[PDB]
RNA sequence: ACCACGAUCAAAAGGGACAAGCAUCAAGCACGCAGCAAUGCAGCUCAAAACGCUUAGCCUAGCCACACCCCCACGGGAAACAGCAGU
């Protein structure tokens, strides 16, 4: 995705957790504690990745 | 439904906070009971003393 | 086609006030190394238009494209404060937080 | 040296081949001013 | 011969500066230095 | 402003009846016949309480923040007087550099104990510089004539117009 | 289409991206912002390389630039093959 802004923050919460800003103007929250970064990859895939059927269209 | 399913699922995580949080607050009264009681002894020679 | 600056959503710290009504923000990218194949911070400097000048330098904010710029160097605006700096709000649990420690214990709301 | 100074540094810079005699040039036409020896 | 090298240098660097300077004002469209400008002597004790 | 010499030692205040003492007893456990020390204690206990939001804790960065100015001022009350101190005048710098940077710590994550730092303790924050880079006599005086050319083209165009 | 509805193609304008060497080129010198304007603030770029000098057509279904020179061409130098063949 070389086009989406990914940034990073340190040590300014409690709790570790991912936000992700859509076009639209949405906030989509995923909170990532006592999760693995397979079961977090996993979970992004789902929430806002695209499906197998799109990429083999595209 | 994708975002439903996520706020969802925020909302078990946050329950799991809460239960966590709640036996750590049950560990840590006790440890701070323990730690208050003997503050109080100090405090008590420490005022015995200077009397 | 709502708007012609490229950068439509940007997060950024702000790193100047100096400007009326206009905050200075430092958004860094991720950019490859062609040669070593490790991703290095790029940075960018962005003014985006700050109408009531509650922007504070160290914070992180969240610029929304002008549909049109309003000056030379202007052409995002302040759509919220991400972070204030050393007001932190934590998202997850909506208490105040003093960086990994709770100002507000979540059990006591 | 590490990454970041390799990062930083950037691909090597070979410098610049140096011009020989012919000045990069297979030949070059000349006219004789004087001949001599040298030991 | 040092030194009346080293001090031509220096002449010839001052004026370079003084160039600089006057070439600044020139082109901002000013006739003249700043009222009230003197070019100080830096190379120089 | 210094405590008052009458001022009686931080572990003699809570004692019970240290009201119904000889005044030569009160003498004896007040702040004139004690080191500069005790003094320096009184001071760090009400800054504490008029600052911190619990006195009692003393590893928070702001109870850090205003023990370590309390030295500071005993520092340079140390080098007003001996001023070839060199020991000390590196400690004091250091000790101004620790607390310049525990009231950064402090900003990115407490504000509002941060402003309440800044105000009790008269303690004015100031920013880093940008760019360390020499500012040799050609530069200075370089600047200054692109200063003065400004306000003169200023002053022109405002005119012309 | 030819009534445009709108497609295709593609300028000018706005946003972004975009060669190499030299830091013995380290400061640039007005390079910003706000207001309907009057005017106000003093700002803007830069060792994460600004500013500058030098080198080079490029990222090749092709593209860019140039078209005797004065970047341009009212005007001036002056009378033009960097179209083919040829000298
Ligand atoms: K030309
Ligand atoms: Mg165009
Ligand atoms: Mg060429
Ligand atoms: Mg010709
Ligand atoms: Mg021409
Ligand atoms: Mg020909």
Same mark, same amino acid.
């Given at each position: 995705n070389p086009w989406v802004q990914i940034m990073m923050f340190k040590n300014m919460t409690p709790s570790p957790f991912l936000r +992700?800003?859509?076009? $639209?103007?949405?906030?989509?929250?995923?909170?990532?504690?006592?999760? $693995?970064?397979?079961?977090?990859?996993?979970?992004?895939?789902?929430?806002?990745?695209?499906?197998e059927e799109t990429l083999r269209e595209e | 439904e994708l975002m439903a399913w996520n706020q969802a699922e925020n909302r078990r995580l946050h329950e799991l906070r809460i239960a966590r949080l709640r036996q750590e607050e049950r560990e840590q009264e006790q440890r701070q009971a323990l730690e208050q009681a003997r503050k109080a002894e100090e405090v008590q020679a420490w005022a015995q003393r200077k009397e | 086609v709502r708007s012609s600056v490229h950068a439509r959503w940007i997060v950024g710290k702000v790193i100047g006030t100096k400007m009326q009504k206009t905050a200075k923000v430092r958004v860094t990218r991720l950019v490859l190394d062609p040669?070593? @194949?490790?991703? +290095?911070?790029?940075?960018?400097?962005?003014?985006?238009?700050?109408? @009531? /000048? /509650?922007?504070?330098?160290?914070?992180?904010?969240? %610029?929304?494209? %002008?549909?049109?710029?309003?000056?030379?160097?202007?052409?995002? #605006? %302040?759509?919220?404060?991400? +972070?204030?700096? *050393?007001?932190?709000?934590?998202?997850?649990? *909506?208490? =105040?937080?003093? *960086?990994?420690?709770?100002?507000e214990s979540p059990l006591s709301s | 040296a590490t990454l970041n100074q390799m990062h930083r540094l950037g691909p090597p810079k070979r410098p610049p081949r140096k011009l020989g005699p012919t000045e990069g040039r297979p030949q070059l036409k000349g006219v004789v001013l004087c001949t001599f020896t040298r030991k | 011969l040092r030194r009346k090298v080293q001090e031509g240098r220096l002449?010839?660097?001052?004026?370079?500066?003084?160039?600089?300077?006057?070439?600044?004002?020139?082109?901002?469209?000013?006739?003249?230095? =700043?009222?009230?400008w003197q070019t100080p002597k830096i190379y120089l004790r | 402003?210094?405590? =008052?010499? $009458?001022?009686?030692?931080?572990?003699?205040?809570?004692? =019970?009846?240290? #009201?119904?003492?000889?005044d030569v007893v009160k003498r004896l456990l007040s702040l004139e016949m004690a080191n500069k020390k005790e003094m320096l204690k009184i001071k760090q206990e009400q800054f504490m309480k008029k600052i911190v939001a619990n006195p009692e804790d003393t590893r928070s960065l702001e109870a850090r923040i205003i023990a370590l100015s309390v030295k500071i001022r005993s520092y340079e009350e140390h080098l007003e007087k001996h001023r070839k101190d060199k020991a000390h005048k590196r400690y004091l710098l250091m000790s101004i550099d620790q607390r310049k940077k525990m009231l950064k710590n402090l900003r990115n994550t407490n504000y509002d104990v941060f402003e309440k730092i800044c105000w009790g303790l008269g303690i004015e924050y100031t920013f880093p510089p940008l760019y360390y880079r020499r500012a040799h006599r050609r530069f200075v005086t370089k600047k200054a004539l692109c200063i003065r050319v400004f306000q003169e083209t200023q002053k022109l165009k405002k005119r012309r117009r």
């Open positions: +992700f800003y859509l076009d $639209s103007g949405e906030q989509v929250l995923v909170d990532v504690e006592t999760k $693995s970064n397979k079961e977090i990859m996993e979970h992004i895939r789902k929430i806002l990745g695209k499906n | - | 040669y070593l @194949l490790k991703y +290095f911070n790029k940075r960018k400097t962005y003014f985006a238009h700050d109408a @009531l /000048q /509650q922007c504070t330098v160290g914070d992180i904010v969240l %610029l929304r494209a %002008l549909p049109v710029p309003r000056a030379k160097h202007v052409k995002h #605006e %302040l759509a919220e404060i991400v +972070f204030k700096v *050393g007001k932190v709000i934590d998202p997850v649990t *909506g208490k =105040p937080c003093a *960086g990994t420690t709770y100002l | - | 002449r010839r660097k001052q004026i370079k500066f003084e160039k600089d300077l006057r070439r600044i004002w020139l082109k901002a469209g000013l006739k003249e230095a =700043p009222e009230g | 402003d210094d405590p =008052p010499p $009458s001022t009686l030692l931080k572990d003699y205040q809570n004692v =019970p009846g240290i #009201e119904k003492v000889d």
